[PDB]
Amino acid sequence: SEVPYQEASSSGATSTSFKEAALSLEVTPQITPDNRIIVEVKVTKDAPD
């Protein structure tokens, strides 16, 4: 779930910053022929405060 922070800012800045405390995988796999992968993965386990 993405907790929001409404930085509701009167003068020009409305930044409802919102960030999810979640189990998540962000994967960018590159496959090599011999059934292997070099992958850039960001693995985050974030629990709601």
Partner: protein, 49 residues
């Protein structure tokens, strides 16, 4: 709930974004997650415990 509560609203998101190839007559698992939580708490007076 907090949004329903009119507080700081953390919406709950379960979302997978990906590009995959499948046949028409085919069903696949785009993504899956299993969350296994095992919690044990025992409170004990030493002698009687």
């Amino acid at each position: 709930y907090q949004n329903m509560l009119n507080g700081v609203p953390p919406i709950n998101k379960n979302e997978v974004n990906a590009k995959i190839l499948v046949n028409d007559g085919e069903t696949i698992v785009i993504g899956g997650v299993f969350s296994n939580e095992q919690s044990k708490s025992v409170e004990k007076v030493p002698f009687l415990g």
